[model samples]
Target: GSISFHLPVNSRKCLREEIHKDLLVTGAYEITDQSGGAGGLRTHLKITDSAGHILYAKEDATKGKFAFTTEDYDMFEVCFESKGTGRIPDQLVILDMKHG
Candidate 1:
């Protein structure tokens, strides 16, 4: 599946997915300035399992991808937080995920 949305500066957004144990899942995400320019913005991404264990994390990231096998049958969360110096107020985020 895929998703696209706008995330305001100093704000956060999260998406959730459920998977069974041993399933292979992969996801890719991109973050861009809303105004289509290099706006000196920063984005943080956190991926966690239902037990609140972080599976992946990145700071000051504009784009990245991750792949892993589920360790448990649970819900996983992908969260993005945007931060800026008040010059740019928002950013555009695109996410694509797939599993079998």
Candidate 2:
């Protein structure tokens, strides 16, 4: 499965991950961007693992910068909430591990 989200302007995006009782999560992450301004524009994703571990992360400025490590396990997962500062940035695109 794939995941996508819209980053809110001037706010930090937050997310949490949870695996179903019988299902599992191989690896999860988000692809984001904020292209509207220069002075205060950024995209981020805060992922929480099933064990309650919080991982604060952000996307790249240019392109093709997947800033996430694949966690090989059934219980590991990810979540996404976006924050695009200084103007309502463009859409925050996302792709799952299987998509690419």
Candidate 3:
């Protein structure tokens, strides 16, 4: 999946940090609930390094047909300063990753 977009520094940072916790959970913890995005999110979540290389990605919220893998990254960016034709608002999910 090669969905392209641009982002700012801070937002990206927040997103990467969030993803890192998820990655750790995916490995150390048990993640189950898979919800997507919500509301009007005009951006995507990008996990990358300082060199501006994408490692892992998903919609700002949507989960389906997206990729999920845990490795390791130092800095990442999630931005909403994107401009183009396909202004697809990605879904951000409050996952119910807990199973009873």
Candidate 4:
């Protein structure tokens, strides 16, 4: 699935996903500026849980960068907002983690 939000400077948007007994092993997330030519702006991303633990965070990030994080939670809180101009295009994914 995909995630998306839009806001102004110093604004915040939050989202959550139910685990439903689905074990969260490992994952990665990325954001895109699908603003239909609305590029060249800055944004931030932070993934966490209801307990206020930081999972993944990035500042001044854009479509060119890919952020990675390890997941072991039953639920997830996705927090994102814009400090610049553009549309919000976010995508998150979690995959089972393999061990040796």
Candidate 5:
């Protein structure tokens, strides 16, 4: 599945999904500053399992990919947090996730 959305500066957004054990899951994401400004647009990405265990995380990231096998049949979450100078008001994010 795939999704795209805008995240306001100094704000955060998260998406969740549920999967069964031993499933292979992969995800990719890209982030861009909507204001088209240069520099000062920082984005944080984090993924966690139902038990609140961090599966992947990065700071000041623009794009990345992650893949993992489920350890349990539970919910997982992917989150994005934006931080930037006041000049940049928001960011655009495109995310894709798949499982097999």
Candidate 6:
């Protein structure tokens, strides 16, 4: 149980708007297996708001490249799980809409 990276933000206003209201933020992620059997690895993703309601979740997701958008971003939690095989050292990359 840990806080994910301090997501990249564009400006103070951008951050404020997101913190004060509901917003959708995109996330992209990929995984790499140390043993080279990336195909066998399994993954799960979850996002929840401060109110403790699940916004998004997936089980046995496809690896490689995929995208997702947050449901409510004022305050949220991200949970990612890895199973099956091979140690993975991967990071979830959030697409900052404010910057673009």
- Compose the digit string of candidate 3's lDDT tens values, residues 24-79: 22211111112221223334445455467765555443333323344454344432
lDDT of 1 at 9: 77
Clashing pairs in 5: none
Clashing residue pairs found in predicted model 1: none
Model 4 reaches what TM-score against the true structure? 0.51
Residue 21 displacement (Å), model 3: 15
Highest TM-score among the candidates is held by which one? 5
- Candidate with the larger TM-score of 4 and 6: 4
Q: Write the per-residue lDDT of candidate 5 for residues 1-100, one digit (tens) a residue.
A: 9989998887899998876657777999999775775446678898888898998889777888988667765678899998766656668899999987
lDDT of each: 0.82, 0.45, 0.34, 0.51, 0.83, 0.43
Instruction: Compare candidates 5 and 6 on TM-score and give the better one.
Output: 5
lDDT of 1 by residue, 10-99 (tens): 889999877665787799999877565445567899999888899889987778898766776567889998776656656889999988
TM-score of each: 0.84, 0.45, 0.29, 0.51, 0.86, 0.48
Task: Please state every model's RMSD to the true fold in angstroms.
Answer: 2.2, 5.4, 10.5, 6.3, 1.9, 9.2
With candidate 5 superimposed using the best TM-score fit, by how many Å does residue 88's alpha carbon deviate from the native? Answer: 2.0
Per lDDT, the best of the predicted structures is 5
- Best-to-worst TM-score order: 5, 1, 4, 6, 2, 3
Q: After aligning candidate 4 to the native by TM-score, how far in Å is the CA of 16 from where it should be?
A: 0.9
Model 3 lowest lDDT segment of ten: 27-36
> What count of clashes does model 1 give?
0
Error of 1 at 8 (Å): 0.4
Assess candidate 1 and give its TM-score to the true structure: 0.84
Q: In candidate 6, where is summed lDDT lowest over 10 consecutive residues?
A: 7-16
For model 4, residues 36-99, the per-residue Cα lDDT tens digits are 3244455677777656687777776444333333345556766666654444443232222221
Score candidate 6 by lDDT. 0.43
